[PDB]
Design a protein around this ligand. Structure first.
Ligand SMILES: [Ca+2]
Ligand SMILES: [Ca+2]
Ligand SMILES: [Cl-]
Ligand SMILES: [K+]
Ligand SMILES: [K+]
Length: 279
């Protein structure tokens, strides 16, 4: 299938070269997969979600996304126009308040919640979690991410936006999850993107158009925007039978566009998420 005039990031994920605007993907489109977006929540009523999104959990007085960030990440995972996996099921877990903040113990509880909650969902093709959040290093936070991955969930986490070595951030520094750096449309490392040997992959992160709250849309930038491309990619590949939750991060690294990004620091992977789709 072919989506013309797609967001640049979607076109980039299905391309061997920058500078194209059509997104190519197998029509299976992540059908029968699930992706949890652990974030400020998801405006499930947005027309772009088409009934495929819902809130399953909050830690605050509401499950409403009053920020917009979780909606944007979710729209990149699986919205009809702005998503990688256009037919996936989306589950919202509100660990971050409407300011985009959340205590580490709440974030941990959300990740353990998904590890159990997947047992209450229909996801024959596999389960992904997209974690577009971080703070300083915490072994508790890393361990929680490690359990979620261990339980059978493809975990994708933002490297962070400090233009620094992601070893000092969590859950970015957890070796067993998929740590995602950000690139721009000219294949430069995003200026804010974290880096380091703990990075597994890069996705589109700068000027990423997607859903927003109040049923609208906007472009914003961050390793938070790159993470859902990789999460949406994993869901899509799992529907295709190409990989599993334990192996998806490796499979994505293995099948990446290689050596193509500029300003990648020595010692950091030069790998750009790519679906390898032949139309
Ligand atoms: Ca990692
Ligand atoms: Ca890893
Ligand atoms: Cl409110
Ligand atoms: K630096
Ligand atoms: K190359």
């Amino acid at each position: 299938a072919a989506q013309t005039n797609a967001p640049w990031g979607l076109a980039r994920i299905s391309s061997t070269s920058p500078g194209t605007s059509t997104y190519y993907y197998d029509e299976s489109a992540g059908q029968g997969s699930c992706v949890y977006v652990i974030d400020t929540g998801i405006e499930a009523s947005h027309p772009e979600f088409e009934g495929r999104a819902q809130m399953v959990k909050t830690y605050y007085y509401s499950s409403r996304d009053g920020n917009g960030h979780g909606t944007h990440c979710a729209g990149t995972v699986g919205s009809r126009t702005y998503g990688v996996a256009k037919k996936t099921q989306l589950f919202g877990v509100k660990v971050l308040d409407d300011n985009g903040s959340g205590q580490y113990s709440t974030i941990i509880a959300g990740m353990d919640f998904v590890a159990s909650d997947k047992n209450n969902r229909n996801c024959p093709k596999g389960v992904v979690a997209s974690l577009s959040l971080g703070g300083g290093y915490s072994s508790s936070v890393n361990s929680a991410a490690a359990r979620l991955q261990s339980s059978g969930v493809m975990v994708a986490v933002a490297a962070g936006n400090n233009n620094a070595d992601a070893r000092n951030y969590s859950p970015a520094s957890e070796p067993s999850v998929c740590t995602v750096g950000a690139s721009d449309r000219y294949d430069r490392r995003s200026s804010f993107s974290n880096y380091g040997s703990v990075l597994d992959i890069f996705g589109p992160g700068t000027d990423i158009l997607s859903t927003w709250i109040g049923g609208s849309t906007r472009s914003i930038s961050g390793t938070s925007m790159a993470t859902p491309h990789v999460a949406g990619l994993a869901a899509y590949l799992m529907t295709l039978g190409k990989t599993t939750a334990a192996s998806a991060c490796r499979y994505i690294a293995d099948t990446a566009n290689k050596g193509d990004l500029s300003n990648i620091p020595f010692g950091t992977v030069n790998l750009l998420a790519y679906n390898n789709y032949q139309a």
